[PDB]
């Protein structure tokens, strides 16, 4: 096999890029274009585990946001129910944010962001101990999540999207559409957090 | 209105399962829990889903299939349509099965949000009924290209009644699938 001699080069199906908080990973899957559309391998356990994305994905969720300006977050589940999340957008576009909420983390309360869209087909890995938020930038946006842990309603916590300590620079700040739970999120200084940093 | 979080319905080939998730709608849009390992395993959907794929069929009348992977690489598949609509087919290709060569179908759409479980030992085929149809697959084995096999969509022993209404669009691989009587199949029935 010519590949085994390194004389024939075949691309792996993903590019993994560590973000400035390096446990957060941007994944760029290959779009295979054919005469009737495209095919994307969006997840392969062997490749993902080789890049430190560990755990079993026990739950998948699908949200549709009809209007630009929908904002969902900041969301996390208390230990022992913390969800690692693989986030992607099958239609539309979001500004996606990951916030480090691991006690004793040198990047506690820090965040990174990226645009996930149906145009780029990018995916974000948000490890356990992080909160997720998203702002919808296009109508009819469909977000898909793979989660490590199953949903546990009593473990769910909410931090205010515009918390002034986290100070996320959201590209839109007026006429946002928030759920009642999200409108009522707590400020970081009063948030209940039990996730611990482990190096 | 659905009261329960998933409804699991066995097909006339009872290993094939139609799943109907509950859609939670509010003024922002909707939320669906499309998979939960705990619930799925309680209804006989076993295995680890090691590979996910997303296929967009821009053109109505795309027909893909009939596809399966030889043991030990058989992929069980959960199939759903996130946008658009397909006629989805599962064919039992387990040697010694009482339903060997038989098929069941369902219409999967972004309107019904239904999902089909196609267990290992079965071939999958689909016919795209709407433009810009997005299919999502969860597979129980990672893809092994050399294990992939192809049976003619129009095999006369299987005799799928495809609801063809448009010019049919077949790949060269699919146009070149073999007839069932000549196909290489190693899956074995155990049920
Ligand atoms: O590091 C800071 C943290 O201590 C907290 O205040 O959240 C904001 C972060 O910038
Ligand atoms: O029972 C039939 C079987 O014998 C085989 O030929 O495939 C088609 C089935 O309908
Ligand atoms: O669009 C894809 C791109 O994001 C990746 O970087 O290279 C493969 C392409 O198909
Ligand atoms: O057609 C192939 C399908 O059968 C398999 O499950 O995933 C890869 C595709 O190329
Ligand atoms: Na897990
Ligand atoms: Na896309
Ligand atoms: Na999903
Ligand atoms: Na099963
Ligand atoms: Na296959
Ligand atoms: Na999926």
Residue numbers in the entry:
A (entry chain AAA): -10 to 188
B (entry chain BBB): -2 to 188
What's the publication's text?
The evidence presented in this and previous studies strongly suggests that both CBU1838 and StrM act as TDP-4-keto-(6-deoxy)-glucose 3’’, 5’’ double epimerases. RmlC uses a histidine base to deprotonate the substrate and a tyrosine acid to reprotonate from the opposite side of the sugar.
We determined the structures of StrM and CBU1838 by X-ray crystallography, in the presence and absence of TDP. Both proteins show an overall dimeric architecture consistent with previously solved members of this family. A phylogenetic tree suggests that CBU1838 groups with other 3’’,5’’ epimerases, while StrM is closer in sequence to the single site epimerases. CBU1838 shows 27 to 53% identity with characterized RmlC orthologs. As C. burnetii does not produce rhamnose, it is unlikely that it would be required for rhamnose biosynthesis. This is consistent with its expected 6’’-hydroxy substrate. CBU1838 contains a methionine residue (M123) in place of a phenylalanine conserved among other RmlC orthologs, which would provide space for the hydroxyl.
